[PDB]
C-alpha cells in the first residue's frame with residue numbers, strides 16, 4: 767500500500783522553469799525545444815515491492831521499474847546514462863540521478879488531487895503539475 771496515492775495515469779497540465787532545468791542538466795538546444803513541447807502521460811503502478819513509472823509522450827517514452835532504496839541504471843529521455851535511487855521520504859518519492867560527478871533530484875508529491883513533480887539541479891528548480899488522466 768506504500769504508494770497507493772501515486773498509482774494511476776496522470777497528464778501534465780502545467781510547467782515552470784523546465785527549459786532552465788534542462789539547460790542546467792546539460793540538454794542541448796534542439797532536444798530542449800522538442801522535449802519542452804511534450805505533454806507526457808506519467809503512469810505509475812505497483813506490483814508487490816516493484817514500482818513502475820512510465821512517461822509517454824510524442825518526444826520519448828521511458829519506463830523505469832525499481833525497488834525503493836535499491837540503485838538501478840536509467841537512460842533518461844535526454845539520453846543521460848545515470849545511476850538512480852528512489853526512496854520514499856515522508857510520503858514523497860525522492861529520485862536521485864548520478865552521472866559524470868553530477869546529481870539531480872526529482873521529487874514527486876501528492877497535493878490535493880494533483881501530483882506535483884519538482885526537479886532540482888544545483889540552484890535551478892522546475893515544477894511540473896500533473897492531474898488524473
Ligand SMILES: O=C(O)[C@H]1[C@H]2C[C@H]2CN1C(=O)Cc1ccsc1
Pocket residue numbers: 778788793801806808821842843844872883885894
Ligand atoms: O516527467 C517530467 O515531467 C519531467 C521531469 C521529471 C523530469 C524529467 N521529465 C521529463 O519530462 C523527461 C525529460 C525531458 C527532457 S529531459 C528529461
